[PDB]
Design a protein around this ligand. Structure first.
Ligand SMILES: Nc1ncnc2c1ncn2[C@@H]1O[C@H](COP(=O)(O)OP(=O)(O)OP(=O)(O)O)C[C@H]1O
Ligand SMILES: [Mn+2]
Ligand SMILES: [Mn+2]
Length: 470
């Protein structure tokens, strides 16, 4: 079997489950979780073009280096997709994450020079932008309407074989960290796909779980909840425990298993192996720092990492309760006492808590609003953190989805966004003011602050939350 433990059950579905699974599929369609076939075809064609461009570019580099016409004919090179698109659960509007793999004689500087310029002159390319200095260097672009994220890695091979498998740990041998980092995404996705007993059953279940998570305000890695990869690993673990089950049963078991999971026990998809390389590896036995993590979900490819180290007491507590409510609803569905539509109902967040904090961010232009909001979102856990230190707080629940905030100046156009944070109690002006000052200070010291960029927060009872949003 798959996984580090024996499965819970090997039982196959009954015709009863088959019909329940078909109903799940019908309930999901209206939400747009299934991309249209025509769009899927368009994306396939886009990838074919990119792949040929990569091959063409590498051939040119090979020739310009007077390499023997011997190698030139077989240097190869290709694009490897990873992430949501590769797992097949991407939704309308999602980008395509791809890794350009080239032989050793192709340098990173070439990727950002000759390849970049090749893309620049393609008719289908718009908004071409390079981010060479990021943790993971990338070239971003809009290709025929589809957003593409392209990473780069030059392997210690003279030629790139078509059957090259990136899961081989030896490939990381003494490579620059930028290359190692650029390879992790493809390796994690490929590992996941080879760690579940049935890919189709796994896929449908994940589509369901991701929609459920978003609809229940717990979808966001940045804010301390779970991101796409983390949800995929939890679904994968569930699949390993019920190898012959189909989607309707797997969705139900997903809530059974995780609502009862004993955190901080880690979620592992396979047994980790020890590798000589000196890369960061999550392991509480040898790293005391990892012992503090509250809800560990470990990536399966070396070097393994905790995909959810941002989880705090508040977010974990919120998600545990959501898993329990999810289980209850699926129990009803299995008894035909409720429809799948009830599981995807997005409760009114603006009513589940007695107290809230409203966070406002604004800028002089729409362009600056976008940049500002990104910066502020990355700091919100600082406020949550300080709130958890407050003797009167049980938890703070940040609704990951922000939205346009009401007007303030009726005479001029405004570019303002807002977040709503739910609170649970066992004066918050000092903690809020302290967080406000910190955001301004860090932004300014980072050279990422523009005049007139504002941020303000207020505490308000549920009843008065009414008079502060459309
Ligand atoms: N531009 C990027 N730079 C670095 N890592 C990336 C980038 N895009 C994706 N990844 C990595 O791949 C993981 C899986 O990607 P995926 O979940 O498909 O992207 P996503 O960010 O959810 O989608 P969107 O970018 O919103 O369309 C998430 C992250 O660890
Ligand atoms: Mn993506
Ligand atoms: Mn991306």
């Amino acid at each position: 079997h798959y996984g580090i433990t024996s499965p819970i059950s090997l039982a196959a579905p009954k015709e009863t489950d088959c019909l329940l699974t078909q109903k799940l599929v019908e309930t999901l369609k209206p939400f747009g979780v299934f991309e249209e076939e025509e769009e899927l075809q368009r994306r396939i064609l886009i990838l074919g073009k990119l792949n040929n461009l990569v091959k063409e570019w590498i051939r040119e580099i090979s020739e310009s280096k007077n390499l023997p016409q011997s190698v030139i004919e077989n240097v190869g090179g290709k694009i490897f997709t990873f992430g949501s698109y590769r797992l097949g659960v991407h939704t309308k509007g999602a980008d395509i994450d791809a890794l350009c793999v080239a032989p050793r004689h192709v340098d990173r500087s070439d990727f950002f020079t000759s390849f970049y310029d090749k893309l620049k002159l393609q008719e289908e390319v718009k908004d071409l932008r390079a981010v060479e200095e990021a943790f993971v260097p990338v070239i971003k672009l809009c290709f025929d309407g589809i957003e593409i994220d392209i990473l780069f890695a030059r392997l210690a091979l003279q030629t790139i074989p078509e059957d090259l498998d990136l899961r081989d740990d030896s490939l990381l041998k003494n490579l620059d960290i930028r290359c190692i980092r650029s390879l992790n995404g493809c390796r994690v996705t490929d590992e996941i796909l080879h760690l579940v007993p049935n890919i189709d059953n796994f896929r449908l279940t994940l589509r369901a779980i991701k929609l459920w998570a978003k609809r229940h305000n717990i979808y966001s890695n940045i804010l301390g909840f779970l991101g796409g990869v983390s949800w995929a690993m939890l679904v994968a673990r569930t699949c390993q425990l019920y190898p012959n089950a189909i989607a309707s049963t797997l969705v139900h078991k997903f809530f059974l298993v995780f609502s009862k999971w004993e955190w901080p026990n880690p979620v592992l998809l396979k047994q980790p192996e020890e590798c000589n390389l000196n890369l960061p590896v999550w392991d509480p036995r040898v790293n005391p720092s990892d012992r503090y993590h509250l809800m560990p979900i470990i990536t399966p490819a070396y070097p393994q990492q905790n995909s959810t180290y941002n989880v705090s007491v508040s977010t974990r507590m919120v998600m545990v309760e959501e898993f329990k409510q999810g289980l209850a609803i699926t129990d009803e569905i299995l008894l035909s006492k409720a429809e799948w539509s009830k599981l995807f109902e997005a409760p009114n967040f603006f009513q589940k808590y007695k107290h809230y904090i409203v966070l406002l961010a604004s800028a002089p232009t729409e362009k600056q609003r976008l940049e500002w909001v990104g910066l502020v979102e990355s700091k919100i856990r600082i406020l949550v953190g300080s709130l958890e230190k407050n003797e009167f707080i049980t938890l703070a629940h940040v609704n990951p989805q922000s939205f346009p905030a009401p007007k303030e100046n009726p005479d001029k156009e405004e570019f303002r966004t807002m977040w709503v944070i739910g609170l649970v109690f066992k004066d918050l002006t000092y903690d809020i003011q302290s967080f406000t000052d910190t955001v301004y200070r860090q932004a300014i010291n980072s050279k990422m602050f523009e005049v007139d960029m504002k941020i303000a927060a207020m505490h308000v009872k549920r009843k008065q939350l009414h008079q502060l949003l459309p």
